[PDB]
RNA sequence: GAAUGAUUAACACUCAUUACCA
RNA sequence: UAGGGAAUAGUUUAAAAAACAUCUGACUCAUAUUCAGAAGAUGGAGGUUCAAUUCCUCCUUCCCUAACCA
RNA sequence: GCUAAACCUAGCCCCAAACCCACUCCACCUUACUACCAGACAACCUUAGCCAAACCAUUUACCCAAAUAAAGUAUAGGCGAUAGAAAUUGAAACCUGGCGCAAUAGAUAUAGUACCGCAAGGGAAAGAUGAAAAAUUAUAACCAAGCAUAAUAUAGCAAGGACUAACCCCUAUACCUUCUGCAUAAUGAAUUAACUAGAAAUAACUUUGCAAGGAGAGCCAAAGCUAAGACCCCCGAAACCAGACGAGCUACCUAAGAACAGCUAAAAGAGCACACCCGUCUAUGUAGCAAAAUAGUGGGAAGAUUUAUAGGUAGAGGCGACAAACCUACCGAGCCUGGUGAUAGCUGGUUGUCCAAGAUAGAAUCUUAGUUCAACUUUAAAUUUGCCCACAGAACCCUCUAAAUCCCCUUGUAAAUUUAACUGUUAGUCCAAAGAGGAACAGCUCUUUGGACACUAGGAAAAAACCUUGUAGAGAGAGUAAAAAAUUUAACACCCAUAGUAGGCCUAAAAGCAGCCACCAAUUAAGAAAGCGUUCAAGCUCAACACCCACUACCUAAAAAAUCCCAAACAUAUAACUGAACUCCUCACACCCAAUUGGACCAAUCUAUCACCCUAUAGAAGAACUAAUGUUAGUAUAAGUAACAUGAAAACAUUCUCCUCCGCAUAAGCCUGCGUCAGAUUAAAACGAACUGACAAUUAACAGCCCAAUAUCUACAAUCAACCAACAAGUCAUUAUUACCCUCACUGUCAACCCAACACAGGCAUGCUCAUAAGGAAAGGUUAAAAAAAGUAAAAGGAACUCGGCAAAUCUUACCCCGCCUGUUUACCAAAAACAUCACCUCUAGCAUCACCAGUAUUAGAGGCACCGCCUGCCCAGUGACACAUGUUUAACGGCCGCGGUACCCUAACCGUGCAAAGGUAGCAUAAUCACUUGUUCCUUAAAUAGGGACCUGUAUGAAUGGCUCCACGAGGGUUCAGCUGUCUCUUACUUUUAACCAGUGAAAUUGACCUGCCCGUGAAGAGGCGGGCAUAACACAGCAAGACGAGAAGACCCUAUGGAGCUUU
RNA sequence: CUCGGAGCAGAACCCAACCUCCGAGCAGUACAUGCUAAGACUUCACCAGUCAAAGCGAACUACUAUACUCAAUUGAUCCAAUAACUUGACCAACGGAACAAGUUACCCUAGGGAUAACAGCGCAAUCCUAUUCUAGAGUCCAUAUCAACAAUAGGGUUUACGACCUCGAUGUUGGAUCAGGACAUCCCGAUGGUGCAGCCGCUAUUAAAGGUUCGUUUGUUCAACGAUUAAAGUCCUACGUGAUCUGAGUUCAGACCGGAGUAAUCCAGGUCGGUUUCUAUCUACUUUCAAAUUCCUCCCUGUACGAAAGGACAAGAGAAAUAAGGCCUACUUCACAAAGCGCCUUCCCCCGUAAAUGAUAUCAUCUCAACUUAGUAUUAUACCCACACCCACCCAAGAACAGGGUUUGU
RNA sequence: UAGGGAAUAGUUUAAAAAACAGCAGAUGGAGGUAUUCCUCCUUCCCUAACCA
């Protein structure tokens, strides 16, 4: 019986984020419904979708969640966004992917409320 | 260590050169 | 096989200094001692920091310890 | 037919009621049960701990004076576990009963007896007629295991299907527990009978009552409330604490006793050697003679000796020449009783029938042998989707542009979620697939997806994990599913060869063929050469011509293990057949998973009411046993086995043979225990009797049982006590005065005997006998096997045996290690080198009326070391102790060095430099001293890891936790000369015991059941029991020890447990 | 030992190893990091954790301004401090006990084959063997002999690994005793090759009937050494065999030395000492009756061979050892007999190859062509073989039983 | 962490001086009415904490 070694590797047990799309394409959500959680922007905030400081993308009005394709401009003042667009060959348009809530119903109703 | 010179009255030294198991 | 420590001038120590050794001079008839001068160093590689012997990391050399119970 | 079986009483339990309490004479706290004398001692003083807190450390309910209620409230608490009031409230109360037991029950109870223990203390078993036994030839019978009547015939979990037929044929791997998985060679179980194990709240559910109220004050209430039904086991530690009991064993001590021949020396912890004490070595024995013995051999035996008697020290302790010894057979700390039903996440066990549902992501945890929450699983309830899935849809960064998933209408289906209430599972196996670790090893380890297994059946030889197949019954129908192993191998050309030229160059030589360049040309045809060869050449081939139909294939390679190959066989008759619990068929249908969960029934018993040859509806409960190394009893198996016993003849008078270990007596112990008579009860055999009943008996002079007061007295051992010389300094003695006229009581007295469970080869003090005047018998009979035990003798050799000369024989030499010596220790595996010890040294203490001590520093106590001889070096920084102003102290705890260089190499007188309290000094050294190591050398042997002497840096020797020498001593360990021998070469013969046979008597462990073969294979991985083979009428007796993973002891090694205990400690 | 990122885990989520890598236990800026509140997420439970519309109050009409940048950057309850607000653990064993270390070989109990040591089993890295390949060595020459880099198989003797049976026990080294088996043969037999003249060797094929020594030191298995031998084989059998033995070693309780430790005590160390039970129920077995192996001497022969030195084989003869089976004349132990140290007997084959003839393929060719020879045994033969006289007696027969004799039953 | 106290030249003292160390040299820092009055901060000491 040869004394053996030991590893030299520690750490790295953290369990599942748990992350990823909670609504998929076509699904009913209420306002606040969270629709994905990501650690990094994989699906973009697009109608009526709001964004958390931690990334996550919820409903901000009650209807149906889409998941479409467009085109990314980022904001001027994003520094690092722009120093890549800036750089991109004349011609060719950055594409991702956004998600939207489509409302289903409207603000309100005229009713009819007295006749004076 | 060897040879060679330099050195000494001649040497030694020194310097320089050469070649099982429970 | 596992573990801890160490590496500084040619030599041995210190927190970039002393000691001698080495070279220079003086004293001696000459040598040593002595006196006055001079030079020389942070095992290796990588990185942090404006700055690293002094913060970390791997490798080499060496040392010390353990390597058991039926 | 035996053994047995059966019984209904004895009494007992729980309540009620009631307060309770004895007495002849005599004896009884001293040694209890003892007629009768001088004393004066006197009682109180907090329970602890197990356990719970998942350890444990504060803490952890225990009647304390009225049932209920207030209330598990206030309050307390590692604010944890758990503990827990009061104010206030306020009831009933008629002993003579029982849905209690009925001889393993109920009291332990026929009895606190027998029996066990020194003691405290522990503590049984069992009886059965009838009106009459002054009816006893009576009261029938049938029933457990075990046997008998009546042994057995190839083959195999002992049966099942069957059959004319018991067997033969075919099919079939006991049961429980425990596991991933057990025929397992894993656990338990000889068998019978009896006994022997699920206790309750919180809620919820079900069925009644009443209902915004319910309830027979308290409580609850936004349909509640009241009542009822229905769920929560048994045995087991090592421990802990309290109070008693123990020093008749043993350790040590106190008082007063006893023993020690002979010889040597005559001085002796001196030698030889009895008694006596001890227990070195070997064999025997191992349920024995013996819970430590016997035989031989050994150590001691005038001393630190051995030993009888009484007394002392007691468990938080004693005692100890420290062995963790010994303290009543078992002491890391006694025993008994109690706390106590200690606790156990650990093992084992858990009792009628039938059906149903039912396999598993993970998280935390002093947690991974367990729990709680999730998940899964079950039941009841609610109302609404569940499952399968169409498009559309879900990322860039990056190398496998993976198999897939997610979402999801339709559709095919029938589930799903929610509400209420719980338990169990949370120690996992193989297969396919994607990977990781390892060795692209594992029947290996780790995740993922799926399957199977832990449930059925068929198949793959046997076969958990592969294939087929699942839903349950009957059938002497039927169709099928999976389902059988194929293969066979290496020929090959014939013929012929001249030449520019030995091409050039290089080279000693290079001539087709070491290298470099060219690679042209003669002959119809032949490379300025493709393979060999020659030192260079020669020489043999191939590519050429000619001859001429070689008319090639151009894909490939073996084998070996251990008990014995392994179905038998077969190349030839027409695609089929066989084959399940699948499916169909006639009839029927709740009727094949562990844990767990739901449900339907039910034996017997008691009670209410029925019933009335054994029942019904209900209410109850000590309500069901193929398993706990279960408890008690009975009887088997081993087994008529192991084992045990009586000297011979005779007229039972006596005599003979042989032992003598003794023997007689006293003390202690014991208590009528081989005397008579009468019984046939019996001695490990036997009708004499030690057993039963009765009747007798031991006679004091021996011994025990003693003494008026007060004061006073007592320097001068003993040893033949005389010489002589001692130390350890000793067992023996009065007087004065007063008082005192009396007599022979009382008790022990037996034996073949005590302590050891026994009629035990053991233990047991003293006197005398010293081999006997006393006391005894080794052989039940026979035979004369093995193995075994105890002896005797042995050719030639003489340690060649063996770990070792163990044992035996003979009887001796020298040396080494350790310890100075005599002595002491682990009673029962160690007798030693361990302890003590003379000696030496350190430390403490200036003193009296209970140890030390009736002592006083030349003393006493606490320790170290271990006579003597030579010695005991350096260090006080640290720790300790002492001392105080620094400090002192090692024969206190302890410690006592590096790195680099210099005489060729080894080494360094030497030199540099750092560190420290000091740097291991003298000695000794391959050691009983970490390894290296069988170090080197001399001696020893034919040969030596042995032994002796040296060399040694031992970098881990070393100086009172002592170093080194050395006399004497040693059942210490090692070596050796000589001799000796059956130790051996290499065994043999005889005797005794045992043995075997006959007769009598008659155990133990063990035992699931057995109808109890061998081989290979298989398998929970080592098969009498499975597969394939082979073998095979039946049954004794004697041997053997290869297997039955043989018996015995719930492995002492190892790990685990929030299990113990002893010891140490900063 | 807690926390985060990445791979394993390629595409919703989840996913382990004492698996592979890298990090965290802060810092910085704000000071509305104010209040409040729909709807959701969630590390597979709980605890904890996460994102947020609207609204109030602010800010604001320049600020990717509105739950700050940032991945982790962290700690429950009780309790303590504090007027309040609020604060407090590397409680890092990081779901945290308010506070507790050693040692036990003097040990104990409960369990575990859920888990080690022995053996089995699995596996074959390691270990051993064979073949393939043709570099190299062997003067030349790959293949007499040896052999690198590699390749393909086999073996199951080693050291490991795994943890499947067994911990209500499967007794642990070496030796004694008795051995069963494999052949990968050490000796003896039969053959091919040789860098085989001969004598000796080397290598390969075949052969497991028979055989395979005694001693000094060591507990040894081994190893060294002495002396022999035809040879002193390799292995398996629970590293065969302790209900047959042994107990030197190893591995309990005593003790010493060196070393470690404050001590208790301890060490792969060394050293002295240290109890080895069992009456056999079952299986199995208790005359495989009887063919023998080997060395040496003489002779062949100083022949074959060879320059010499040296020096055979076959046949023949003799004498021994061992083994097996018997026996007692003598010797010896002994004495109506049993014994050895004495005497007597002992018998067949071995298949690897070497050669003819002769086809496929009109030569040739020993032929998994037909065939011929070396070249083979029904292994030979041997032993055993007739039986109610049998009460009893005797016995060279024997445990009992059985057997022989009794014409040896006063 | 809590308070108490303290800070002079490199060092240690005095009431702006001497002594040592190497003619230089100081009133820890900031603010206020100046070593000498007060306050906050730094460093250090003292004493008590450092629990859960
Ligand atoms: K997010
Ligand atoms: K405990
Ligand atoms: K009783
Ligand atoms: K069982
Ligand atoms: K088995
Ligand atoms: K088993
Ligand atoms: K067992
Ligand atoms: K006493
Ligand atoms: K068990
Ligand atoms: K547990
Ligand atoms: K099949
Ligand atoms: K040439
Ligand atoms: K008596
Ligand atoms: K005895
Ligand atoms: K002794
Ligand atoms: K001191
Ligand atoms: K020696
Ligand atoms: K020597
Ligand atoms: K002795
Ligand atoms: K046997
Ligand atoms: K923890
Ligand atoms: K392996
Ligand atoms: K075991
Ligand atoms: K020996
Ligand atoms: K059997
Ligand atoms: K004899
Ligand atoms: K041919
Ligand atoms: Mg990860
Ligand atoms: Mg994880
Ligand atoms: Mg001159
Ligand atoms: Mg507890
Ligand atoms: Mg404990
Ligand atoms: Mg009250
Ligand atoms: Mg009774
Ligand atoms: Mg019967
Ligand atoms: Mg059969
Ligand atoms: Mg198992
Ligand atoms: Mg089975
Ligand atoms: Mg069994
Ligand atoms: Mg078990
Ligand atoms: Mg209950
Ligand atoms: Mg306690
Ligand atoms: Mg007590
Ligand atoms: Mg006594
Ligand atoms: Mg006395
Ligand atoms: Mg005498
Ligand atoms: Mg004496
Ligand atoms: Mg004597
Ligand atoms: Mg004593
Ligand atoms: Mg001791
Ligand atoms: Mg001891
Ligand atoms: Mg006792
Ligand atoms: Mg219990
Ligand atoms: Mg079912
Ligand atoms: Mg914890
Ligand atoms: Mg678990
Ligand atoms: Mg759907
Ligand atoms: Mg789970
Ligand atoms: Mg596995
Ligand atoms: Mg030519
Ligand atoms: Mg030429
Ligand atoms: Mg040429
Ligand atoms: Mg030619
Ligand atoms: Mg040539
Ligand atoms: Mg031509
Ligand atoms: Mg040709
Ligand atoms: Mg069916
Ligand atoms: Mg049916
Ligand atoms: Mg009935
Ligand atoms: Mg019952
Ligand atoms: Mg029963
Ligand atoms: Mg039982
Ligand atoms: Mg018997
Ligand atoms: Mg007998
Ligand atoms: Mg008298
Ligand atoms: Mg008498
Ligand atoms: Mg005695
Ligand atoms: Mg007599
Ligand atoms: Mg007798
Ligand atoms: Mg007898
Ligand atoms: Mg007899
Ligand atoms: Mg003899
Ligand atoms: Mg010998
Ligand atoms: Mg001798
Ligand atoms: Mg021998
Ligand atoms: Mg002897
Ligand atoms: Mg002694
Ligand atoms: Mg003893
Ligand atoms: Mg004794
Ligand atoms: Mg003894
Ligand atoms: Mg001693
Ligand atoms: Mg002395
Ligand atoms: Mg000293
Ligand atoms: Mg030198
Ligand atoms: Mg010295
Ligand atoms: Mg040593
Ligand atoms: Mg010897
Ligand atoms: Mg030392
Ligand atoms: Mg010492
Ligand atoms: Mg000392
Ligand atoms: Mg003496
Ligand atoms: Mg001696
Ligand atoms: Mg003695
Ligand atoms: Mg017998
Ligand atoms: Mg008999
Ligand atoms: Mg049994
Ligand atoms: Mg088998
Ligand atoms: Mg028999
Ligand atoms: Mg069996
Ligand atoms: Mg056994
Ligand atoms: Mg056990
Ligand atoms: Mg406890
Ligand atoms: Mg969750
Ligand atoms: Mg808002
Ligand atoms: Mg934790
Ligand atoms: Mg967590
Ligand atoms: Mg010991
Ligand atoms: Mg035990
Ligand atoms: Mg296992
Ligand atoms: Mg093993
Ligand atoms: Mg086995
Ligand atoms: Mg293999
Ligand atoms: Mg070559
Ligand atoms: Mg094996
Ligand atoms: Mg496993
Ligand atoms: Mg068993
Ligand atoms: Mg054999
Ligand atoms: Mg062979
Ligand atoms: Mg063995
Ligand atoms: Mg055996
Ligand atoms: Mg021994
Ligand atoms: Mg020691
Ligand atoms: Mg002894
Ligand atoms: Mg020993
Ligand atoms: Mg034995
Ligand atoms: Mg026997
Ligand atoms: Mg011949
Ligand atoms: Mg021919
Ligand atoms: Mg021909």
């Given amino acids: 019986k040869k004394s053996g070694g ?10 599942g984020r748990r992350q990823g799309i ?13 629709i994905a ?18 990334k996550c993308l919820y409903a901000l009005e009650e209807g149906i ?5 467009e085109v990314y401009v980022p904001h001027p003042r994003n520094t690092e966004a722009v120093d890549l667009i800036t750089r991109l060959p004349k011609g060719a348009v ?18 009819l409320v007295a006749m004076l």
């Fill in 6 to 15: 030991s590893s030299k590797n520690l750490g790295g047990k953290s369990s």
């Fill in 22 to 34: 909670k609504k998929m394409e076509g699904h009913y959500v209420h306002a606040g419904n969270i």
């Fill in 37 to 54: 959680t990501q650690r990094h922007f994989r699906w973009h905030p697009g109608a009526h979708v709001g964004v958390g400081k931690n």
């Fill in 65 to 69: 969640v889409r998941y479409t394709k």
């Fill in 94 to 111: 950055l594409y991702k992917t956004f998600v939207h809530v489509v409302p289903a119903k409207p603000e309100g109703t005229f009713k």
